């Protein structure tokens, strides 16, 4: 909360012009609809009280039908200057704010991102705070002068027209506005209890799409639809009451509005027959208070955005001003002439200023000679990037002088000092630009010639030519998503252009494949010529090429020697322990880097309006009562325009005895047809939600029941991942609710007006009811634009500014890399030119949408001055009179307003969603493997378990390049063991994926008991085969269910004995709730070793003859692994087993051990066989490894 009138601090001379015009021109538009009614009261009062002198009919009406065109045409230059000088004065005060919010955050030291505000929010606050400030300069101030103009002019064309009918009307507007306040709140209670329950029943599909490999493995793909049904039966009983609370919520408006014109239109009839008030002045005074009375009601939402503005701007002015203390522009600095790379650190102690007690650096002493290959290889977790983060002078040391040619870092100029030092971190940084721009961030003023040879030295120039756009390829969201080595070599070239004198490299090839890390070292050795070089490395090749090696120890330099002297010490020194931490990062890198790859016209609406509304036919008895209630509220929207009209004819009758009677009908009917509005308005909106929701639940339970029939190969395809399936069941399920439900209640009750409004037109006077019906399109159009107003034109500016935000998103997040260069003037000048095409676009939407509301409020107030011109032309030529003509006119205009307050009450159909394409694509995709196929040979009794593979070839449809299996055959015998091993990670699990029929082999037969797996019912053949997954994640339920999720039915004693045989029952007996303990992702997270025990407890319940054990290791307990295997000795009692593991002691007693090699078996035998008959193979060497 800064204040008001400090938001406008970026203002200049010209923005004090666009707010003068945006205020006065928004004041003329406010004082119009009051000063239109008094040209309407004075018209009818003169048109209707001269029924004997026809000469004072022409020059009276034609005078006031030229005060409508002026009131018309003065809403060109008062609504093409309000809407088009605030939405352009909120683009010269927000856009100049986002520039200074990036000139004063990237120009701020790193410690500001540590002890002040997080880096998670300063990337957030440029997106969410710099929009809700912009909505309080432009729109919600322009919609606030406009109301106080209507409000004050609501009470001066009011209280001086008629005294005593203004005081009564002002005692009514409370009774309306306090009921419209009940209507807006009690919906918002259910609007946040309903969708919260949908987020409860929205992750129940997320606990199946993520774990699809276990759900489709077992039979239970139906029983995880049985929860998603019953978790939405809650979401109807929070949806049925939404209609019944909106049904009475409109009913208590049409009860008060009718029963407050039973008074104001009686008390008007008391005034005329005591000679105080005419007939124009008693319908004008009645409206001009009920215009200005309710126009104060929308002055609160424009006020509420002046509360969130002044506080969400206060988070931005914290960073704008914010004096630093480190001397970046230190023009009282010194300069050198010839550096040599002489770097020394003496008695340096340093830790972070976030935990000011640690001793990360403790008397650090490094001596770097000029032009060497010195390497800092110490223990992990001992800094090992903070040491790099001081030679750059990110921070400042607590105590100790950092020497550079015998000079301190607190002497030179940082703008000049950072130019000599090149730097490559572990992960590089490339911004959403082209290629040459991401190269010129090192040095600005190089030509094209110096760039092209340098990237060729870095071995990047080859595939840049292979790119289609060359060096103008837009790297970022587009740019065909270059690989990590390709991202690496550009940043290597980004330092080569700079020509540094000192080199700093921290884990260059730590995340690169064996192909490109050779290619990097081909470029590094070219770049390490004659330069002072400090490399923290990852492999021995740099260590062998290292000149001098220093060894850290707990924040202290321990060993200072060479590559050979530290190697000659043997295991006496720490250099042998450096090997112990070396290849721990070698093999775990590209195994896990593989895991990143292994884990990854009107005929369009022809039947989609009809096939959709054909499965919506067990409920026709609830949509032929809500159509009855849509006609009755169709009449009462137009019957009210008749009573208000025909009273206005009674006021000009000189018989004060027909006037007491013929008011006393139109007051008693107005109460008698007020009680039959509230009763028949909770049938129009209540029964069009019981037809509403019971379609929507019937669609959500067919989509998930038809996603789970697609093959496993369908499910990892490009768009079918986890976060994109729940979107197709959240957007497509709710956007299809508003297509059959709303647009029968709207299309009918905007026809029940026309049979009652135009009937009064084509009975009383058949000639006036053509000209009004010909101009009847432009009236109902012009009321929609008065209702698209008050929500503001040009909404949702996230889409117009999502491209420019991405450059500020990556720049703040890379604040060490950006400040490692002097690239803090280009990220300013490139944040500019991502705004200049979305700045001119917001301009020309001002000059178009300003006039598109400008004309359509002139064609309304002109078509009133042509309707009421054809009134006096009939009276002058004796074809009609006053009583029939003004009874026609006000019916056809007040009903015309009542039409347009239907289209903006049930919105979102006029291409509100074309999502009907996305639904029927998903319900009607055809599979190739039917998971429950009728007419198939059944499963026999409890079989011997003959697993056998014959001449099998495989290829994933995601990557059909590499063939996995090349004429592979393998046979499990009648129930002993077929334990398999192999090299190169747990990708070997793609043998189990062939048995489960998750995929299809390229050639061969998958025969079981001499019978193919295409000759069984697929759920029936997935009955007898258990499977332990690799990394078990669990369901957000009880442990008692996750073990009961292993059979069709479940009994108590079967769960208890099996978990005891699983040997997890002990600590389960020591848990707080034990079996009924709530686990998953919403409660107690467990250990990975106990996650293994639950998964093994799952598989034992199946009593499966065939069993497929994946990696049962990484249960870090030598006691438990032996004891579980003792039970696993009994877990194969007459059972066929494939056991796939790592440690050879598990397969020590295995019958048939085989090795995967090049799509073929390598060796066949066991422990006593392959060490006897083929002792020179792979099976003997890995025993010495373990
Ligand atoms: C026949 C026309 C010449 C007419 C006078 C016209 O100028 C005027 O703009 C009409 C369309 C408006 C002006 C005031 C409006 C009313 C504003 O005050 C009312 O009585 C409110 C009460 C309540 O808010 C209703 O939902 C709308 C309702 C009932 C409006 C119905 C239509 C109007 C009567
Ligand atoms: N503000 C901070 N920024 C970074 N590290 C911090 C900070 N405060 C404390 N630290 C500690 O500094 C340590 C630096 O990490 P570590 O010593 O494991 O090597 P590293 O810097 O991560 O090496 P690399 O970046 O090459 O992986 C962290 O373990 C962290 O606990
Ligand atoms: N879930 C998956 N979907 C599609 N393709 C995959 C999947 N997992 C892995 N792959 C592909 O298979 C390749 C290697 O995984 P695979 O399962 O073939 O291991 P493997 O060759 O059997 O390993 P091993 O050396 O242990 O025999 C990867 O390059 C990857 O592209």
From Swiss-Prot:
Free-text tissue specificity from the UniProt record: Ubiquitous, with high levels in peduncles. Mostly localized in young developing tissues, including meristems, as well as root and shoot apices.
Domain of life: Eukaryota
Keywords for this protein: ATP-binding, Auxin signaling pathway, Brassinosteroid signaling pathway, Cell membrane, Glycoprotein, Membrane, Nucleotide-binding, Repeat, Transmembrane, Transmembrane helix, Transport
Gene3D superfamilies in the cross-refs: ABC transporter type 1, transmembrane domain, P-loop containing nucleotide triphosphate hydrolases
Induction notes from the record: By auxin. Induced by brassinosteroids (at protein level).
SUPFAM superfamilies the UniProt entry points to: ABC transporter transmembrane region, P-loop containing nucleoside triphosphate hydrolases
Membrane topology: Multi-pass membrane protein
Cellular component terms per the entry's GO annotation: endoplasmic reticulum; plasma membrane; plasmodesma
One Gene Ontology term from the biological process aspect of the record: response to blue light
Record note on quaternary structure: Interacts with 1-naphthylphthalamic acid (NPA) and FKBP42/TWD1.
Stated role: Brassinosteroid exporter that, in conjunction with ABCB19, supports the accumulation of exogenous brassinosteroids (BR) in the apoplast, thus promoting BR signaling initiation involving the specific receptor BRI1 and required for plant growth and stress responses. Auxin efflux transporter that acts as a negative regulator of light signaling to promote hypocotyl elongation. May contribute to the regulation of leaf position and morphology during PHOT1-mediated blue light responses involving auxin distribution, especially in low light fluence.
Protein name in UniProt: ABC transporter B family member 1
């Amino acid at each position: 909360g800064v204040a008001f009138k400090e938001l406008f601090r970026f203002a200049d001379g010209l923005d004090y012009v666009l707010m003068g015009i945006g205020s006065v021109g928004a004041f003329v538009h406010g004082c119009s609809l009051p000063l239109f009614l008094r040209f309407f009261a004075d018209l009818v009062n003169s048109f209707g009280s001269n029924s004997n002198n026809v000469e004072k009919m022409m020059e009276e009406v034609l005078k006031y039908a030229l005060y409508f065109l002026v009131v018309g045409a003065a809403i060109w230059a008062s609504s093409w200057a309000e809407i088009s000088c605030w939405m352009w004065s909120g683009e010269r005060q927000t856009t100049k704010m986002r520039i200074k919010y990036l000139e004063a955050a990237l120009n701020q030291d790193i410690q500001f991102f540590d002890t002040e505000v997080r880096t998670s929010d300063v990337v957030f606050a440029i997106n969410t705070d710099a929009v809700m400030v912009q909505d309080a300069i432009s729109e919600k101030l322009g919609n606030f002068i406009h109301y106080m103009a209507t409000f004050v002019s609501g009470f001066i064309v009011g209280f001086t027209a008629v005294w005593q009918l203004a005081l009564v009307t002002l005692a009514v507007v409370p009774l309306i506005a306090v009921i419209g306040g009940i209507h807006t709140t009690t919906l918002s209670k259910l609007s946040n209890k309903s969708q919260e329950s949908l987020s409860q029943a929205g992750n129940i599909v997320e606990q199946t799409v993520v774990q699809i490999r276990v759900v489709m493995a077992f039979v239970g793909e139906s029983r995880a639809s049985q929860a998603y049904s019953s978790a939405l039966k809650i979401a109807q009983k929070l949806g049925y009451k939404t209609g019944l609370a909106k049904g009475m919520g409109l009913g208590a408006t049409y009860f008060v509005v009718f029963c407050c014109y039973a008074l104001l239109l009686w008390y008007g009839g008391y005034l005329v027959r005591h000679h105080l008030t005419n007939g124009g002045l008693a319908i004008a005074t009645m409206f001009a208070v009920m215009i200005g009375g309710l126009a104060l009601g929308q002055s609160a939402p424009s006020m509420a955005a002046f509360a969130k503005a002044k506080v969400a701007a206060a988070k931005i002015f914290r960073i704008i001003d914010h004096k630093p203390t480190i001397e970046r522009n230190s023009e009282s600095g010194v300069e050198l002439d010839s550096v040599t790379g002489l770097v020394e650190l003496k008695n340096v102690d340093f830790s972070y200023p976030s935990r000011p007690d640690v001793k990360i650096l403790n008397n650090f002493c490094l001596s770097v000679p000029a032009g060497k290959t010195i390497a800092l290889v110490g223990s992990s977790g001992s800094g090992k990037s903070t040491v790099v983060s001081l030679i750059e002078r990110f921070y400042d040391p607590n105590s100790g002088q950092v020497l550079l040619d015998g000079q301190d870092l607190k002497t030179l100029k940082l703008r000049w000092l950072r130019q000599q030092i090149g730097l490559v971190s572990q992960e590089p940084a490339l911004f959403a630009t082209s290629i040459k721009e991401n190269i010129l961030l090192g040095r600005p003023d190089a030509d094209q010639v110096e760039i092209e040879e340098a990237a060729r030295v870095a071995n990047a120039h080859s595939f840049i030519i292979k790119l289609p756009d060359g060096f103008d390829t837009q790297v970022g969201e587009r740019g065909l998503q270059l690989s990590g080595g390709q991202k690496q070599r550009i940043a290597i070239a980004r330092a080569m252009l700079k020509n540094p004198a000192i080199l700093l490299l921290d884990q260059a090839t730590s995340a690169l494949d064996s192909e490109s890390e050779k290619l990097v070292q081909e470029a590094l050795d070219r770049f390490m010529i004659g330069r002072t070089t400090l490399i923290i490395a990852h492999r021995l090749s740099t260590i062998r090429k290292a000149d001098l090696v220093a060894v850290l120890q707990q924040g202290s330099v321990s060993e200072i020697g060479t590559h050979d002297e530290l190697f000659s010490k043997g295991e006496n020194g720490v250099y042998a322990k450096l090997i112990k931490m070396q290849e721990a990062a070698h093999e775990t890198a590209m195994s896990n880097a593989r895991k990143s790859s292994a884990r990854p016209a009107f005929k369009d609406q022809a039947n989609s309006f009809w096939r959709l509304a054909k499965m919506n036919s067990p409920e026709w008895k609830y949509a032929l009562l809500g159509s009855v209630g849509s006609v009755i509220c169709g009449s009462l929207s137009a019957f009210f325009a008749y009573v208000l009209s025909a009273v206005l004819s009674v006021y000009y009758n000189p018989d004060h005895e027909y006037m007491i009677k013929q008011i006393d009908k139109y007051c008693y009917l107005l109460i008698g047809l007020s009680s039959a509005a509230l009763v028949f308005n909770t049938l129009q909106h209540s029964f069009w939600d019981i037809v509403g929701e019971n379609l929507t639940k019937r669609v959500r339970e067919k989509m998930l029941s038809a996603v789970l029939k697609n093959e496993m190969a369908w499910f990892d395809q490009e768009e079918n991942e986890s976060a994109r399936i729940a979107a197709r069941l959240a957007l497509d399920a709710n956007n299809v609710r508003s297509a059959i439900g709303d647009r029968i209640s709207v299309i009918v009750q905007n026809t029940a007006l026309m049979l009652v409004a135009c009937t009064a037109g084509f009975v009383l006077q058949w000639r006036l009811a053509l000209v009004l019906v010909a101009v009847f399109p432009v009236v109902v159009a012009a009321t929609v634009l008065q209702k698209m107003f008050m929500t503001g034109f040009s909404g949702d500016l996230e889409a117009a500014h999502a491209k420019g935000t991405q450059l500020a998103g990556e720049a703040i997040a890379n604040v060490r890399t950006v400040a490692a260069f002097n690239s803090e003037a280009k990220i300013v000048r490139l944040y500019t030119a991502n705004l200049e095409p979305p700045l001119k676009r917001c301009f020309w939407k001002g000059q178009i949408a300003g006039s598109g509301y400008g004309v359509a409020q002139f064609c309304l107030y002109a078509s009133y001055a042509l309707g009421l011109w054809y009134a006096s032309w009939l009276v002058k030529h004796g074809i009609s009179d006053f009583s029939k003509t003004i009874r026609v006119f006000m019916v056809l205009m007040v009903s015309a307003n009542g039409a347009a307050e239907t289209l903006t009450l049930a919105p979102d159909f006029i291409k509100g969603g074309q999502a009907m394409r996305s639904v029927f694509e998903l319900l009607d995709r055809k599979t190739e493997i039917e998971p429950d196929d009728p007419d198939t040979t059944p499963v026999p009794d409890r079989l011997r378990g003959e697993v056998e593979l014959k001449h099998i070839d495989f290829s994933y449809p995601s990557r059909p390049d590499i063939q996995i299996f090349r004429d592979l055959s393998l046979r499990a015998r009648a129930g002993k063991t077929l334990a398999l091993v192999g090299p190169s990670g747990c990708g070997k699990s793609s043998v189990i994926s062939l048995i489960q029929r998750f995929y299809e082999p390229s050639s061969g037969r998958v025969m079981i008991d001499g019978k193919d797996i295409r000759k069984y019912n697929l759920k029936a053949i997935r009955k007898h085969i258990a499977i332990v997954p690799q990394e078990p994640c669990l369901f957000g339920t009880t442990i008692y269910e996750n073990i009961a999720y292993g059979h069709e039915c479940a009994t108590e004693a079967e769960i208890i004995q099996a978990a005891t045989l699983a040997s997890a029952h002990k600590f389960i007996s020591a848990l707080p709730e034990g079996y009924k303990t709530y686990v998953g992702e919403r409660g107690v997270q467990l250990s990975g070793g106990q996650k293994q025990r639950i998964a093994i407890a799952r598989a034992l319940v199946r009593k499966a003859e065939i069993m497929l054990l994946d990696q049962a290791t990484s249960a870090l307990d030598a006691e438990s692994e032996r004891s579980v295997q003792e039970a696993l000795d009994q877990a194969c009692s007459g059972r066929t087993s494939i056991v796939v593991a790592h440690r050879l002691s598990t397969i020590r007693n295995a019958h048939v051990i085989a090795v995967i090699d090049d799509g073929k078996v390598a060796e066949q035998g066991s422990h006593s066989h392959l060490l006897k008959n083929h002792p020179d193979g792979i099976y003997a060497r890995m025993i010495q490894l373990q």
